[PDB]
Amino acid sequence: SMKVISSIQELRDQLRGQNRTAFVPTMGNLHEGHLSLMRLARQHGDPVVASIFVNRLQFGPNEDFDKYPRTLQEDIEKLQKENVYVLFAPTERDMYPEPQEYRVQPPHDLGDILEGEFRPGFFTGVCTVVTKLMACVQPRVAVFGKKDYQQLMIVRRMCQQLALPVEIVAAETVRDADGLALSSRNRYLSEAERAEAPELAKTLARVRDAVLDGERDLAAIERRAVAHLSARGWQPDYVSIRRRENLVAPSAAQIEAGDPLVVLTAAKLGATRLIDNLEI
Amino acid sequence: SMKVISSIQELRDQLRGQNRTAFVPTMGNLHEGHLSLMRLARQHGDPVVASIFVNRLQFGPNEDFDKYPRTLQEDIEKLQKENVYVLFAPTERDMYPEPQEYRVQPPHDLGDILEGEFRPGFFTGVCTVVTKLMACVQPRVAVFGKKDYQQLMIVRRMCQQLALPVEIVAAETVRDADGLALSSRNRYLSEAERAEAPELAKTLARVRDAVLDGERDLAAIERRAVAHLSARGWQPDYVSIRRRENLVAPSAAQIEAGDPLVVLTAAKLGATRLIDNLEI
Ligand SMILES: Nc1ncnc2c1ncn2[C@@H]1O[C@H](COP(=O)(O)O)[C@@H](O)[C@H]1O
Ligand SMILES: Nc1ncnc2c1ncn2[C@@H]1O[C@H](COP(=O)(O)O)[C@@H](O)[C@H]1O
Ligand SMILES: [Cl-]
Ligand SMILES: [Cl-]
Ligand SMILES: [Cl-]
Ligand SMILES: [Cl-]
């Protein structure tokens, strides 16, 4: 029987003595992408612990904290079917009984680019809540999705640099039949927006092919991709082809030596901000 | 510059003393799928050696050996952009100067199911040519794609069971913008068929979703998916949900335990036989 636990102390009592816990943090409103992570966690540890917490610290004042989808009863029903031992679903009073004034700050060269330039402070909000959730759960492993590629790398290096004894396991991005990367925010899209939304992944597939087919001027590829999206009524923040190892743009020499690359993008359809990426 | 070599003895002299070679065998008419594998190979060894050879042994008399696309000069131009040190492109007199009568035979149970049920003797043709290619190139590593998932498992077990000192590295499937797995045989499809062909991958995504969402009657999912493709004018051979470890159907107990699964399909669109799979 799955335990739903809001209290930090109760969570510690339930997990007392567990040395192989696999942890999957989420913000709830569960879809097939989350469920895929739950299944992967079970191959890497036991028991599997899920968290559902919408973290105010990683939302900016002009973002979507108040309308973020919240469907805890259904989330519970889904987790029950996937052999998950504990759901940690703290209230905001449990996680933040007084305002949070201790923060985990990531490196400037990694936290302030890409998602960090367009969402100032975002990864301070993420690193702070993830450190806290790991200190509550004390897992051996934690599963993060490649869908939030920058996040995944930030959390990996956080654990290493803060000496947290947690191994990070990366999960592949789960997509809808039409190629759109699954996200609770996909719910915000109108019918017309939903029909256009798959164009973001298609654009990534086309930039992938151009790199594989030998095009060396990466910035020109990025610019064409941005213009293609803009002409169809998107407002892109970026399309950026970077090294997987440090999310820096490769030099000419690194392009020739075939350093593994990833193309990352974020782009709005109306007020809804979608992100996706494709390893190359 | 890339060396293109036809003679086995010359290949041996070129690769003499190389203990870290990564090998990528292909049947030519190269597309972005193959190029992806070349890039991955470079991460796992050096030099990267490609081969291009249409293998008569893995085509039945009613299949497409004579029409199989051959575009060697294009293939050479594409490989030159991917850092590839040697193309091994033997003629049929180079590989088979007399009829091939020594054959490597895989187990029945692996074997004669799925692709081997619908293409009798296929994996004997594959295991034979692959063994021969490995003996010619003598790589440390060889890269095979998940697109041919059953092939990938068959070649891995083959190497371990014949004590071939070659590590198999698996590559993720590369799909088109529209989700269709790239294959040199995509060429065969009419335009109408090309527009329908993404439905295979879409059907796999929905099978995946049904399993993740908790449907335990896997045979029922399989039957719907088959019936779905038929109603749309496909001739399906199979849609089958198997365990990744051994390609056997899981017991109810193994479903409950979350043994990693994969859904596999093969289906005809007119005369063209397409295959695809998705890890669940
Ligand atoms: N479509 C997806 N495929 C794989 N992982 C995902 C997907 N969507 C979200 N995730 C991951 O699920 C975890 C929680 O996501 P969220 O619920 O957005 O906080 C994170 O590790 C995300 O990267
Ligand atoms: N679309 C694809 N994505 C990834 N690998 C592929 C793809 N198509 C073919 N391959 C692999 O590339 C190699 C050569 O395939 P082929 O040229 O069909 O014999 C095999 O290891 C295939 O599984
Ligand atoms: Cl909630
Ligand atoms: Cl990687
Ligand atoms: Cl990968
Ligand atoms: Cl696997």
CA-based nearest distance A53→chain B, Å: 21
A233 alpha-carbon distance from chain centroid: 25
Output phi, psi for A267, to 5 deg: -160, 140
B28 touches B75 (CB < 8 A): yes
- Pseudo-torsion of CA A50, A54, A60, A61, nearest 10°? 180
- Asked if residue B121 and residue B209 are part of one domain, the reply reads no
- Counting every residue written for chain B, the total comes to 280
Kindly state the helix (H) or strand (E) to which residue A76 belongs, with its residue range: helix A72-80
Task: Quote the CA–CA distance of B4 and B90 in Å, as a whole number.
Answer: 9
> What is the DSSP code string of B209-252?
HHHHTT---HHHHHHHHHHHHHHTT-EEEEEEEEETTTSPPPPH
| Pair B277, B149: CB distance under 8 Å | yes
- Integer Cα distance of B74 and B182 in angstroms: 17
Q: After which residues does chain A break, using C–N > 2.5 Å? A: none
User: Is B170 in the same domain as B180?
Assistant: no
Find, among B153, B176, B173, B157, the residue nearest to B278 by Cα.
Answer: B173
The rounded Cα B45 to chain-centroid distance in angstroms is: 21
Cα separations in angstroms, A78 against A70, A214, B213, B237, B279: 14, 44, 7, 32, 20
* CB-based contact A6:A91 (threshold 8 Å): yes
Tokens 């003393």 locate to: B17
Domain boundary among B138, B156, B175: B175
Q: Are residues B213 and B144 in the same domain?
A: no
**SS3 at position B186:** helix
The three-state secondary structure class of B198 is helix
For residues B157 and B180, membership in a common domain is answered with no
In 3D, which of A266, A219, A262 has the Cα closest to residue A238?
A266
* Contacts (Cβ under 8 Å, ≥6 apart) of A13: none
Instruction: Please answer yes or no on whether B206 and A39 come within 8 Å at the CB atom.
Output: no
Please tell me whether residues A154 and A252 are part of one structural domain: no
Q: CA-to-CA distance for A21 and A14, rounded, in angstroms?
A: 12
Residue pair A2/A84 in contact by the 8 Å Cβ criterion: yes
Token pair, residue B64, equals 């497409």
For residue B273, what are the contacts with CB-CB under 8 A and spacing of at least 6?
A: B185, B237, B266, B267
Instruction: Return the residue in A32, A48, A74 with the most chain B beta carbons within 10 A, the one to mutate for interface testing.
Output: A32
Which tokens belong to A171?
A: 């999960």
Q: Are A144 and A245 members of one domain? A: no
Query: At A242, which CATH number?
Result: 3.30.1300.10
Structural tokens at position B239: 């849609």
**What's the token pair of residue B155?**
């070649």
For residue B180, what are its two tokens? 């269709």
Nearest of A217, A225, A233 to residue A264 by alpha carbon: A225
The answer to whether residues B55 and B25 touch, using CB atoms and an 8 Å cutoff, is no
d(CA B271, CA B63): 10
Q: Is B16 exposed, middle or buried (0-12, 13-18, 19+ CB in 10 A)?
A: exposed
Task: Out of B148, B175, B202, pick the residue that ends a domain.
Answer: B175
Residue B77 contacts residue A209 (beta carbons within 8 Å): no
| DSSP for B104-136, written as a single string | ----HHHHSSTHHHHSTTHHHHHHHHHHHHHHH
Helix B8-15 to helix B122-137 angle (10° resolution) is 50
Q: How far apart are CA B280 and CA B241, in angstroms?
A: 9
One domain for residues A157 and A28: yes
Structural tokens at position B190: 């009419």
∠ CA B8-B9-B13 to the nearest 5 degrees? Answer: 115
How many other C-beta atoms can be found within 10 angstroms of the C-beta atom of residue B114? 23
Q: 3-state class of B197 per DSSP?
A: coil
Residues A10 and A117 both lie in one domain: yes
A16, with CB counted inside 10 A (0-12, 13-18, 19+), is exposed
The CA distance from A150 to A154, in Å, is 6
State the greatest distance between any 2 C-alpha atoms of chain B, in Å, as a whole number. Answer: 57
For residues B202 and A144, give the distance between their C-alpha atoms in angstroms, rounded to a whole number.
25
Domain range spanning residue A31? 3-175
| Contact predicate A127/A135, CB 8 Å | no
What does residue B48 show for φ and ψ, rounded to 5 degrees?
-85, 125
One DSSP character per residue, B66-110 reads TTS---HHHHHHHHHTTT--EEE---HHHH-SS---------HHH
Residue B55 near residue B123, CB atoms below 8 Å:
no
> Which residues contact residue A195 at a Cβ distance below 8 angstroms, ignoring those fewer than 6 apart?
none
Same domain, B50 and B92: yes
Residues 6+ apart with CB under 8 A from A5: A11, A14, A86, A87, A88, A89
A196/A202 Cα distance (integer angstroms): 11
Calpha distance A128→A100 (Å, rounded)? 9
CB A46 within 8 A of CB A22: yes
Task: With CA atoms as reference, report the closest residue to A174 among A203, A207, A142, A145.
Answer: A145
Together in a domain, A237 and A160 = no
Residues in B touching A258 (Cβ below 8 Å) = 39, 42-43, 82-83
Q: Residues of A at the B interface (Cβ-Cβ below 8 Å)?
A: 32, 35-36, 39, 42-43, 78, 81-83, 172, 175-179, 201-202, 205-206, 208-209, 212-214, 256-258, 260, 279-280
Resolution in A: 2.2
DSSP letter assigned to residue A29: S
Q: Is the bond preceding residue B111 a cis peptide, omega within 30 degrees?
A: yes
Q: How many Cα atoms sit within 13 Å of A34 on the Cβ side? A: 22
**Together in a domain, B145 and B191:** no
Q: What CA–CA distance (Å, rounded) separates A88 from A107? A: 29
Instruction: Count the domains in chain B.
Output: 2
Could you give the CA distance from residue A263 to residue A241 in angstroms, rounded to a whole number?
4
- Whether B34 is catalytic is yes
Q: Which of B91, B106, B166 is nearest to B135 (CA)?
A: B166
Query: 3-state SS string over A108-157?
Result: HHHHCCCHHHHCCCHHHHHHHHHHHHHHHHCCCEEEEEHHHHHHHHHHHH
Domain boundary among B143, B175, B207: B175
Q: A120 to chain B, minimum CA–CA distance in Å?
A: 32
Take residue A67 and report the two structure tokens written for it. Answer: 């309308």
Cross-strand pairs, A276? A265
Render A178-234 in DSSP notation, one character per residue: TSPBP-GGGGG--HHHHHHTTHHHHHHHHHHHHHHTT---HHHHHHHHHHHHHHTT-
- Rounded alpha-carbon distances, angstroms, from residue B55 to A43, A156, B12, B22, B143: 38, 45, 21, 21, 18
- In a mutagenesis test of the A interface, which of B209, B245, B256 is the best target, namely the one with the most A β-carbons within 10 Å? B209
What CATH number does residue B98 fall under?
3.40.50.620
On whether both A166 and A206 belong to a single domain, the answer is no
Token output for B60: 């039945």
- Please give the structure tokens belonging to residue A134: 């790991």
Test B208 with A258 for CB contact under 8 angstroms: no
Strand order in the sheet with B86-88: B3-5, B86-88, B48-52, B22-26, B141-145, B167-171
